[PDB]
C-alpha cells in the first residue's frame with residue numbers, strides 16, 4: 592500500500608488472463624515486501640480495452656492488457672497482427688513483435704506516443720467461430736449475423752467471409768447470443784469457456800482465423816515513480832506471469848474441444864482453403880490503405896519462419 596496499483600481487463604474472473612494477473616499481483620506483493628499491492632478490475636468495469644489504454648496514458652490506471660493488433664488504432668500498419676491467416680502461430684507473433692524492425696519500432700512508439708511500457712507478451716489463444724447453426728463450410732457464413740469486437744480486423748474477417756457483422760463490446764456478447772440477436776461470435780476456445788458462451792451456442796467451428804497475443808502494459812506515469820528495484824520486481828513478475836499465461840492457453844487448446852463436447856456443443860472442421868482465399872482482397876485493401884509501411888510490415892512478417900520459439 593505504499594503503491595496501491597490497479598490492473599484493468601476485459602476478461603472475467605474465470606479467465607486465464609485473470610489467473611495470470613493474480614499470479615503477477617501475488618509475486619509483486621511478495622517480492623516488493625508489501626510495498627506494492629495490485630488490485631484487479633475485471634469484466635470491463637473500467638471500460639473496454641480502448642478506454643483502459645487511455646487510462647494508462649493519463650496515469651489513472653496502472654496496468655492493463657492489449658493485443659499487439661490493437662495498436663492499429665494509432666499505427667494503421669499494425670493491423671498486420673490480426674489480418675486473418677497472416678500470422679501463422681504464436682512463434683510468428685513473438686518474432687513479429689520483438690525480432691523485426693517493424694515490431695521494435697512499434698514498442699518504442701507505444702512508449703513515446705502512447706505512454707505505456709511493454710513488460711511482457713503472452714499467447715491468448717487462436718480465435719474460432721461459435722454459432723447457433725452448424726458451419727460446415729464457408730457457405731454457412733453467408734448472412735450469419737456474426738458478433739465482432741469493435742476492431743477493424745475482426746469486422747473485416749466477418750465481411751470477407753460473407754457474414755453480416757454486428758460490432759459490440761465483450762460484456763454484451765452473452766446476452767446477444769442468448770437472445771439470438773446475433774447468430775454467433777468469434778473468440779479463442781478459452782474465452783468461449785470463461786464467458787460460458789457454450790451455454791448459449793450449440794456449434795463451434797475451427798476457423799483458426801486470428802492469433803491473439805497479450806501484452807502486459809504499465810502506465811509510464813506509474814512506472815516512473817517506482818524506484819528501479821521495484822521496477823525490476825514488476826518487470827520480472829510480468830515476464831514470469833506471461834510464461835504462465837501462455838501455458839494456460841496452450842494447455843487448454845489441447846483439452847477444450849472435449850470439454851465443449853461434454854457440454855453438448857457440436858464441433859465442425861470446415862475446409863479453410865476458401866476462408867483463406869476470401870481474405871486475399873482484404874490483404875490488397877490493407878496494402879492500399881496503409882501504403883509502403885503496411886507492405887513493409889507484411890513482408891517482414893511473411894519472412895518469419897513459423898517453426899521454433901524465440
Ligand SMILES: CC(=O)N[C@H]1[C@H]([C@H](O)[C@H](O)CO)O[C@](O)(C(=O)O)C[C@@H]1O
Pocket residue numbers: 600601602640656657658660661739740741742760761777778782805
Ligand atoms: C486485451 C483485450 O481486451 N482483449 C479482448 C479482445 C480485443 O479487444 C479484440 O481482439 C481487439 O483487439 O476482444 C475480445 O476477444 C472480444 O471482445 O471478443 C475480448 C478480449 O478480452
